[PDB]
Ligand binder design. Structure first.
Ligand SMILES: Cc1cc2nc3c(=O)[nH]c(=O)nc-3n(C[C@H](O)[C@H](O)[C@H](O)COP(=O)(O)OP(=O)(O)OC[C@H]3O[C@@H](n4cnc5c(N)ncnc54)[C@H](O)[C@@H]3O)c2cc1C
Ligand SMILES: CCCCCCCC[C@H]1O[C@H]1C/C=C/C=C\[C@H](O)CC(=O)NC1=C[C@](C)(CC)OC1=O
Ligand SMILES: Cc1cc2nc3c(=O)[nH]c(=O)nc-3n(C[C@H](O)[C@H](O)[C@H](O)CO)c2cc1C
Ligand code: FES
Ligand code: FES
Ligand SMILES: [Ca+2]
Lengths: 446, 198, 251, 412, 206, 408
């Protein structure tokens, strides 16, 4: 067992009840072109075209061979574009039951399969986009291999679903997916989980590793740092439990499996629970008549690392397994910075709120302060468990020194790994964007 | 034993050649960007000084000191030319030796010897040795301590200038002005060993 | 290129440079020595009360009035030698011509003392009006060198002048203040028992003090150095026997 | 009310307005009374409650016991020293000769020896408040000037620099020298480097080192630490260097300085460095909150104890400072003000948990060294913190270079 | 005129100490008083001009193996002559200037001009650029020594212009102006003021 | 007097001793032996040379001509070679044209490489087939007011093997020519005497080397066609010397002789099915004629093509008949021309304005997917900056935009 002690379990209101129910009826889905890192789409559909499930919508110019396929069967109704004609989303209206089908295998043939056949079926079905390479968090090249595939069978995000409830319903598909991954990988598959039991794959290279402690204990970056440190010449792949279930279903049935079980929670949600939905479902229909009145922010994913869902971006992300809704904090308070805070959360001990242990806060989207330079009081060390120097790495990210950033780390990191550092900064810095800029520089300069 | 360690501590701290005596300031203020390069330059300074000061002490005491050869003849007006020629020749010969025989030590520190062949730090060290009338072991210890103090100061300035990657310097001060101000603020801090008589 | 032309060039250049250098360096030695000496000559003429400006008048008056002599510290009797060119500061470090000072004997922290010291007799006609004793001691930052003029009795002070010091220009560098140096005229070096009685007093001196001069203000660590200087150089190891000889008579 | 008045004049200050060039001063007063009211825009849609304002107000509130005790102590020392020297019709002419005295007697207090805690604190305030006001105004001028010319928003941090500079100076500083010192501290040490969070030295002990080297007679000696006209008396790190622990004596009262007197703070010196008890009371609060560094404090303590014990062990028969124990170094001078409030500056210190220990140890070692073996200066804490501010980045360099070799071995 | 450009460009356009870092040691050391700064300016002018002249005379015959030996022989002979002249006539200034009279040999201006310009140019222009670089160096030396001597001691060239309190006046001298960091601060702010008016000298944001 | 002789003799002996000792230390410690330079893998044709010099002069002797544009000195960036074994360490100036990702393979600028140790070079895939020619000028007809077309005849039936978009290098000895020597017809003369640019003249004292892009396609055997713009002093300060080589090629006329050196090039077209959009201007008509004629005639590709040329006036236009003949026989190609200051004599009913505005408002704005085309471009400097900026605001990736700046 690996035990993490430096972190933060966020005490935000609206924790869900881990009971799965049926969600709203969805009539539109979409594929979001800005959430794939370094993706430049070559469109294969026009507004008015009719599509089938698992039918290609666009490809990648910078990643040859990768296909992004439709989750549902219907009609392309919107191709949204933004600044410099950047693709924002391709919206599809759900109508009919059409699909592209593939080959099906027995549950006992999957562990002994050709890597090229597995890769071909994955790329053609469009489920190859479930993987992400570390470093740079990009979809793998269809002609590459990795010696470590990390399965994320846990979750420590705030207001998140609990993977055991979902896996106990698709044990067979989960085991089939692990059996497919054991043949796809060159080496070992790491099923990172909590102490509770899960269905076991029985291939000799599929191993189970238990992680303990608060967030980030459930992020793939921590697992890679502790089990298989990555670098420029050691790359690992990452996949979550629902994508493994989808892989198992694809190889057992010959059909693309597009079924999510997401957590709908937050301080302004009446009944927080797990709901059944579809890949890319419309987030302005999934939350209809389920939130309190007022002005709120709808988020795809966690409040720590997520995308604000407004307008053309208001669809469930690809790598997201939860929806979060919280109020907007736009009040101005007379001497609000000098009040004794019984309702104010902080990692420091400057407020009265920490003296009431077991409290639950109705947190808003407020930035509790103005933008200021970094005065290091030691907050980044309290929340970062990896074996790095937080303050100096963040100052290298700020100053824009890419080389010393790579030396001090920055290649084992995602934008979700600096979410707590963005959280606890007294200068109100956003470090995910600085890390993405440094990684873009490092990937462009050869 | 106490006589030679007090001289070493004095040379390193009480009388710094970088921040107290102001010798070698152009190279000090120009090669202070990276700690690795400053460390290499400081090691080259240590070697050149510890080899240059004793040899010049020997040459002076054998030739140029009053009454060294003939009673009533002192050639103390050849100090400057003799010292500078010996320093230059010694540095060039050491550079060629490192360049041919030991390539790794050449890439390590021999690549700094052109910058040090004729520098004010070594000339001032030899001049101070002549003024202070040192013995041979005293000259060795003094040269070593002086080189070590110069290296310490330049590596500290390099560390500060690397920490300053986050600063926001006015455009007119960017570079030389802010490096001058930083060296002055370093001397203000090194002024703490002033009253010590060691 | 060619070694022959290289050696020709370097040898010709060496000759052309060395001729000029060694001709200029030897042609100016005597002028350099005179310029070095005139500074001490002017300091002594100033401490002796005589007014002089310009090397002409300085040399004239110093040669007509002041007479250097050599005094043996151990017995305080005159010794014959070359007094005009004696170098006490370099003699003090020589092992044969000096003495190492015991920790308790070293009250002024000078750590050594030459066997013979040079004194200067201010002479009017052939009568000895005063004697100028060179004293030195350790202060807070540097070694401080002074010139004290004593009258024939061996007690009364006629002047003081610190010609070398390196103390903070506004705190302990005030030993060069004319208003402080004017306090020394008329003081007494010894008491009724002929023991050192000069006292540097912290916090002002009572008006009418024959033995006390004002200490420096904010500088009690350089004022201690001056006190130690005089305590030593008026003692049994300093100018004590010579000053007793002067008191008895016959400068 | 005040909210309405603030948003109605906001059009005057936006570009093109009647008073646009004074916008940096309006946004400061607008955010001081009311919170900005902004929202998160990209990610981590919930933010921590702490900001620089609370950090600075918490460091500012911690020095109030020390400030008030320092004012009271300055008043009491001045009154005792005055009643020791003068009496009768001399005391009346000395009181009428100084405004610090006749203002204290005008506002209801008394300058006689039967004065209570109320008139002593008044007399100490008549010395502290002008210095604080001058420092604040003259340093804020340069802050606002740099922010206006460079188009920044004025930020807190000088709120702490100004008070920490005003409490580390003798009660009798001239005001023009305080202005010059705060000017050198703010402009040369902080603002030419970018402002708060972007320098490398301690801005308040770099304006005290300006006045210690430039005007050394008004910040040293025996005439500056008790505000009594014509009173000359030494402090206790100067009385120990002269004759040891047997020489610690208060000449104004004719009593021996005990260990409890220096710990409580009944001794002369810099306005607010005298009460170790009050300094500890404030430091415990700012350390509990996580704003100050207990690693730096422990390093300073370890270094002081080690070097003082070594000096006590090896001993000396000509130097009296060789026999000062560790519990006497603690309560004398500005050791505890510096250990607690000035060494713990986050911007000048080290950025690594392993480097903070070495930084504190160097501060303590250098303080004890400059105290004992440097014959010219009674203490060495402004000189030891300024020295360690130069080698703070080298310790981070060593720690990071050790961390990078651990990475390349694929174990980090 | 071809002359005035060559003599007046190294003063502000291509200043030695402020653009070509060469020459900081003597500028930091000898600028506590103004007489020493003047004498050092004149000495550096003389040595640089004549060394450029002679190196440009013999530039064609210098072997590449012993170039440094020959150039330093010329420079050291000139500096020895200068030091022997200073001791005979201006004795007191030499004592205050003790080691930085010899350090004119290793001053970077004298050697960088002999290497960069004198080996490649005729004799009469090398005298000219040596005089011009000496003027550019003396500009900074005199400008720094002015402030240091005025505010540190209240005197200019030894003449009392500000009456000190310990001489019955009103002025209290600044002690840092006689110490080490003051020269660093003065030269830094001077570089700031120079690069403010001529903003083509500003360095890249890197 | 006794001290002077002793001082002189000891001065001279000290200096002579130091010189002799440093010479003797040098004699034993520097090789002066010989090093061998290695090429692709063949034991034959391997260069041995003195350690004095760089890689450029060492490769220059053995008949191996690397692209040495901009007369070396670390400016062009085309003197790049791959070094297998240990050569010399990188220089910060070489980092200007070579990135940290490229340098790993072994790319270094040959100019800054200092030959003192043996090396192993892997030269770029058999470029040993480079020649130095001498040709007879066929014609020097004037194509525009500031552009002249130089034709050359390769002797003895030999033909230059090159690809569309490549360039040759033309070397010229020291000379002196006056702008009155130029044959500038009265059609384009009126603009010259307005500035009286016949005044200027230039002279050089050592030979110069420059590069020029060919204006004919590979299957046009036995000749080389170029477009050479005259490089006159700028208008702000006109007392600067004219263009050295540009004033020479304009001084040539029929029958004269000049020398050229080998086929080079990097501005090659990609082999896909995507649409191509050729943008040109000024002397950039030289590669754009070479690319277009290669596609429609030699390769006979059926891709969709388009050419957008931007001139100042109709007298500034040329090669019109050649393109109008292609647009008639082939229905894949289309041609458009846009003038900045159309005159009444031009009889102009067409596009007016800058070419980056004409291309956008007419064709690209309504295009179904402008990011899917290949853009080739060559023209004046601020025409490249205006077009690239317009294309970036449409979503086009720099991997599609192929730009050949005329030597920066
Ligand atoms: C691969 C390649 C292909 C090319 N193809 C072509 C082509 O097809 N057609 C074409 O026309 N060009 C082409 N060029 C450009 C051409 O080779 C050169 O850019 C240039 O024309 C060389 O001519 P020049 O030496 O006579 O002009 P230069 O002398 O190099 O031009 C210098 C310019 O600056 C001015 N100038 C000169 N000295 C000074 C000074 N001291 N101070 C101020 N101003 C000064 C001159 O008046 C002139 O305008 C190509 C370049 C490359 C690299
Ligand atoms: C050139 C134009 C003329 C100049 C203007 C005329 C002179 C100006 C002079 O009076 C100064 C004030 C300026 C200081 C600024 C800096 C302070 O650090 C800002 C500050 O107090 N911040 C705050 C403190 C607290 C209360 C708690 C942390 O919250 C804050 O808002
Ligand atoms: C614990 C803490 C201690 C501080 N100590 C000082 C100090 O000693 N001197 C000072 O000028 N500012 C001090 N500051 C304020 C701030 O750190 C200082 O202005 C920065 O150095 C500016 O970059 C302190 C701030 C904090 C939070
Ligand atoms: S003076 Fe130029 S380097 Fe020392
Ligand atoms: S110009 Fe020859 S390499 Fe750049
Ligand atoms: Ca003596």
């Amino acid at each position: 067992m690996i035990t993490i002690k430096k972190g933060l379990d966020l005490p935000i209101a609206g924790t869900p009840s881990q009971v799965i129910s049926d969600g709203k009826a969805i009539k539109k889905v979409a594929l979001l072109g800005e959430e794939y890192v370094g993706m430049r789409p070559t469109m294969h559909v026009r507004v008015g075209d009719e599509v089938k499930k698992a039918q290609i919508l666009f490809e990648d110019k910078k990643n040859p061979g990768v296909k992004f396929t439709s989750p549902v069967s219907g009609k392309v109704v919107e191709i949204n574009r933004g600044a410099k004609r950047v693709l924002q989303s391709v919206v599809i209206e759900v109508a009919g039951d059409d699909q592209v089908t593939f080959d099906k295998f027995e549950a006992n043939q999957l562990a002994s399969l050709n890597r090229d056949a597995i890769k071909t079926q994955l790329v053609e079905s469009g489920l190859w986009t479930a993987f992400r390479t570390r470093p740079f968090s990009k979809v793998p090249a269809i002609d590459s291999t990795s010696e470590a595939i990390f399965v994320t069978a846990m979750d420590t995000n705030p207001l998140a679903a609990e993977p055991t409830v979902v896996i106990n319903e698709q044990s067979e598909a989960f085991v089939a997916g692990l059996d497919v991954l054991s043949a796809l990988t060159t080496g070992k598959v790491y099923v990172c989980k909590k102490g509770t039991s899960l269905p076991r794959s029985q291939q000799p290279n599929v191993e189970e590793h238990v992680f303990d402690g608060p967030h980030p204990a459930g992020l793939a970056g921590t697992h890679m740092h502790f089990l298989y440190p990555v670098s420029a010449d050691h790359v690992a792949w990452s996949i979550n439990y629902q994508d493994v279930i989808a892989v198992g279903q694809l190889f057992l049935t010959g059909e693309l499996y597009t079924q999510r079980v997401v957590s709908l929670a937050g301080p302004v949600v009446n009944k927080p629970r797990l709901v059944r939905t579809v890949m890319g479902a419309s987030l302005e229909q999934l939350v209809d008549s389920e939130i309190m009145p007022g002005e709120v922010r709808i988020i795809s994913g966690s409040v720590l690392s997520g995308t604000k869902a407004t307008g053309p971006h208001a669809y469930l992300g690809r790598y997201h397994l939860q929806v979060s809704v919280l109020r907007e904090g736009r009040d101005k308070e007379l001497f609000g910075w000098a009040m004794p805070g019984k309702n104010k959360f902080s990692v420091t001990r400057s407020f009265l709120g920490h003296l009431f242990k077991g409290q639950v806060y109705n947190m808003t989207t407020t930035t509790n302060g103005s933008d200021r330079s970094m005065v290091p009081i030691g907050n980044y060390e309290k929340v970062m468990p990896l074996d790095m120097e937080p303050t100096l790495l963040l100052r290298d990210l700020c100053a824009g020194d890419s080389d010393s950033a790579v030396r001090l780390g920055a290649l084992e990191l995602d934008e979700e790994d600096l979410a707590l550092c963005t959280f606890v900064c007294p200068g109100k810095y956003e470090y995910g964007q600085l890390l993405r800029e440094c990684l873009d520089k490092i990937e462009k300069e050869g | 034993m106490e006589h030679y360690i007090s001289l070493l501590v004095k040379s390193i701290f009480i009388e710094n050649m970088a921040l107290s005596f102001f010798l070698g300031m152009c190279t000090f203020l120009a090669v202070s960007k990276k700690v690795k390069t400053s460390f290499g330059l400081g090691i080259a300074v240590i070697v050149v000084l510890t080899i240059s000061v004793p040899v010049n002490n020997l040459v002076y005491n054998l030739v140029l000191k009053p009454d060294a050869l003939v009673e009533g003849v002192d050639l103390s007006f050849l100090n400057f030319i003799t010292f500078i020629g010996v320093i230059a020749a010694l540095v060039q010969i050491l550079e060629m030796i490192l360049d041919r025989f030991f390539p790794p030590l050449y890439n390590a520190l021999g690549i700094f010897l052109p910058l040090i062949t004729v520098n004010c730090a070594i000339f001032g060290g030899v001049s101070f040795m002549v003024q202070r009338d040192y013995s041979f072991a005293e000259s060795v210890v003094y040269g070593f301590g002086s080189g070590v103090g110069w290296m310490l100061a330049i590596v500290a300035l390099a560390g500060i200038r690397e920490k300053m990657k986050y600063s926001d310097v006015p455009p007119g001060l960017r570079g030389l002005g802010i490096t001058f101000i930083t060296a002055g603020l370093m001397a203000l801090g090194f002024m703490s060993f002033s009253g010590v008589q060691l | 290129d060619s070694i022959k032309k290289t050696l020709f060039v370097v040898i010709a250049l060496s000759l052309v440079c060395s001729i000029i250098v060694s001709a200029a360096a030897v042609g100016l030695r005597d002028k350099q020595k005179e310029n070095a000496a005139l500074d001490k000559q002017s300091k002594i003429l100033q401490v002796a009360g005589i007014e002089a400006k310009g090397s002409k008048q300085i040399v004239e008056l110093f040669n007509k009035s002041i007479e250097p002599r050599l005094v043996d510290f151990n017995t305080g009797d005159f010794v014959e030698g070359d007094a005009a060119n004696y170098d006490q500061r370099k003699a003090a470090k020589e092992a044969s011509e000096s003495i190492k000072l015991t920790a308790e004997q070293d009250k002024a922290k000078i750590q050594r003392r030459a066997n013979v010291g040079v004194v200067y007799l201010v002479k009017d006609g052939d009568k000895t009006s005063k004697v100028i004793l060179p004293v030195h001691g350790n202060g807070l930052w540097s070694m401080m060198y002074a010139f004290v003029a004593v009258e024939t009795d061996g007690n009364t002070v006629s002047g003081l002048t610190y010609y070398e010091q390196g103390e903070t220009p506004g705190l302990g560098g005030e030993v060069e203040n004319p208003a402080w140096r004017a306090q020394w005229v008329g003081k007494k070096l010894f008491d009724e028992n002929h023991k050192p009685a000069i006292k540097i007093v912290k916090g002002g001196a009572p008006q009418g003090s024959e033995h006390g001069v004002d200490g420096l203000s904010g500088a009690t660590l350089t004022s201690n150095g001056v006190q130690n200087t005089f305590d030593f150089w008026l003692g049994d190891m300093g100018f004590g026997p010579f000053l007793t000889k002067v008191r008895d008579g016959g400068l | 009310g005040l909210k309405k008045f603030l948003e109605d004049i906001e059009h005057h200050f936006e570009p093109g307005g009647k008073h646009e060039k004074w916008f940096a001063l309006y946004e400061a007063a607008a955010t001081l009374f009311y919170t900005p009211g902004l929202v998160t825009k990209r990610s981590s849609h919930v933010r921590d409650s702490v900001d620089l304002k609370r950090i600075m107000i918490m460091v500012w509130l911690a020095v109030f016991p020390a400030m008030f005790w320092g004012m009271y102590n300055a008043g009491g020392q001045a009154i005792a020293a005055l009643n020791h020297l003068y009496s009768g019709d001399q005391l009346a002419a000395i009181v009428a000769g100084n405004w610090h005295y006749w203002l204290t007697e005008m506002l209801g207090g008394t300058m006689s020896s039967d004065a209570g805690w109320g008139s002593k604190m008044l007399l100490g305030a008549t010395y502290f408040l002008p210095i604080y006001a001058t420092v604040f105004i003259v340093g804020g001028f340069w802050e606002v000037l740099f922010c206006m010319v460079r188009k920044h928003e004025v930020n807190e941090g000088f709120f702490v620099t100004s008070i920490l500079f005003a409490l580390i100076v003798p009660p009798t500083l001239p005001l023009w020298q305080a202005a010059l010192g705060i000017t050198f501290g703010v402009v040369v040490a902080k603002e030419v480097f970018g402002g708060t969070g972007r320098n490398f030295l301690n801005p308040a002990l770099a304006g005290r080192a300006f006045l210690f080297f430039a005007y050394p007679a008004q910040i040293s000696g025996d005439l500056v630490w008790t505000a009594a006209d014509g009173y000359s008396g030494a402090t206790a790190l100067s009385q120990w260097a002269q004759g040891g622990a047997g020489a610690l004596i208060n000449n104004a009262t004719g009593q021996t300085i005990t260990w409890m007197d220096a710990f409580i703070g009944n001794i002369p010196g810099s306005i607010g460095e005298v009460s170790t008890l009050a300094l500890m009371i404030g430091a415990a609060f700012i350390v509990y909150m996580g704003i100050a560094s207990w690693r730096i404090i422990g390093g300073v303590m370890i270094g002081m104890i080690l070097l003082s014990t070594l000096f006590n062990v090896i001993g000396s028969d000509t130097n009296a400072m060789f026999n000062m124990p560790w519990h006497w170094h603690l309560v004398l001078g500005g050791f505890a003000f510096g250990m607690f409030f000035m060494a713990t500056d986050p911007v000048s210190a080290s950025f690594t948990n392993s480097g903070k220990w070495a930084y504190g140890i160097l501060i303590g070692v250098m303080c004890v060294l400059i105290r004992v073996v440097n014959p010219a200066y009674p203490e060495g804490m402004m000189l030891a913190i300024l020295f360690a501010n130069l080698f703070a980045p080298l310790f981070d360099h060593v720690v990071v270079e050790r961390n990078i070799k651990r990475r390349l071995a694929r174990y980090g | 005129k071809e002359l005035k450009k060559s003599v007046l460009a190294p003063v502000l356009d291509n200043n030695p100490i402020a653009l070509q870092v060469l020459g900081v040691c003597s500028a930091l050391a000898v600028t506590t008083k103004l007489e020493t700064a003047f004498v050092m300016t004149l000495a550096v002018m003389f040595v640089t001009a004549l060394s450029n002249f002679f190196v440009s005379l013999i530039r064609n015959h210098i072997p590449n193996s012993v170039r440094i030996i020959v150039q330093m022989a010329i420079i050291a002979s000139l500096v020895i002559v200068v030091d022997q002249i200073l001791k005979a006539y201006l004795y007191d200034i030499s004592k205050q200037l003790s080691v930085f009279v010899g350090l004119i040999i290793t001053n970077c201006i004298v050697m960088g001009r002999a290497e960069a310009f004198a080996m490649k140019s005729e004799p009469i222009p090398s005298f000219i650029d040596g005089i011009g670089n000496g003027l550019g160096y003396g500009f900074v030396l005199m400008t720094v020594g002015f402030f240091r001597e005025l505010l540190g001691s209240g005197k200019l060239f030894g003449l009392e212009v500000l009456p000190l309190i310990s001489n019955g006046g009103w002025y209290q001298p600044n002690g840092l102006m006689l110490l080490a960091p003051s020269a660093f601060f003065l030269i830094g702010f001077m570089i700031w003021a120079i690069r403010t008016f001529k903003p083509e000298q500003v360095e890249a944001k890197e | 007097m006794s001290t002077i002789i002793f001082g002189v003799v000891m001065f001279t002996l000290i200096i002579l001793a130091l010189v002799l000792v440093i010479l003797f230390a040098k004699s034993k410690l520097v090789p002066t032996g010989d090093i061998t330079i290695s090429i692709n893998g063949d034991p034959e044709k391997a260069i041995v040379t003195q350690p004095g010099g760089k890689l450029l002069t060492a490769l220059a002797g053995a008949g191996v001509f690397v692209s040495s544009a901009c007369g070396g000195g670390g400016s062009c960036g085309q003197c790049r070679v791959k070094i297998k074994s240990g050569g010399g360490d990188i220089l910060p100036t070489e980092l200007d044209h070579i990135s940290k990702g490229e340098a790993r393979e072994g790319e270094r600028l040959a100019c800054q490489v200092a030959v003192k140790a043996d090396m192993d070079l892997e030269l770029p895939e058999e470029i040993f087939g480079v020649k130095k020619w001498e040709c007879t000028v066929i014609s020097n007809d004037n194509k525009a007011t500031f552009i002249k077309e130089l034709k050359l005849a390769i002797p003895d039936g030999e033909s230059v093997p090159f690809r569309a978009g490549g360039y040759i290098q033309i070397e010229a000895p020291a000379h002196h020519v006056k702008y009155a020597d130029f044959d500038v017809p009265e059609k384009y003369r009126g603009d010259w005497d307005k500035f009286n640019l016949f005044r200027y003249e230039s002279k050089v004292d050592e030979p110069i080397i420059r590069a020029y892009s060919m204006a004919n396609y590979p299957e046009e055997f036995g000749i080389i066609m170029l477009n050479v713009r005259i490089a006159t002093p700028p208008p702000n300060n006109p007392n600067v010397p004219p263009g050295q080589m540009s004033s020479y090629i304009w001084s040539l006329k029929a029958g004269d002789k000049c020398t050229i050196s080998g086929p080079f090039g990097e501005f090659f077209a990609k082999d896909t099915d995507a649409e191509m959009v050729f943008i040109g201007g000024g002397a950039g008509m030289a590669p754009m004629r070479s690319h277009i004629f290669d596609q429609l005639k030699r390769l006979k590709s059926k891709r969709k093509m388009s050419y957008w040329y931007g001139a100042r006036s109709k007298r500034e236009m040329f090669y019109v008949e050649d393109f109008d003949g292609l647009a008639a026989e082939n229905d894949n190609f289309v041609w458009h021309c846009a003038l900045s200051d159309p005159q009444p004599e031009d009889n102009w009913t067409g596009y007016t304005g800058f070419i980056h505005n004409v291309l956008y408002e007419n064709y690209l704005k309504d295009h179904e997917a402008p990011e899917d085309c290949e853009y080739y471009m060559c023209g004046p400097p601020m025409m490249n900056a205006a077009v690239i900026n317009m294309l970036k605001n449409l979503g086009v990736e720099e991997e599609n935009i192929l730009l050949d700046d005329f030597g920066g």
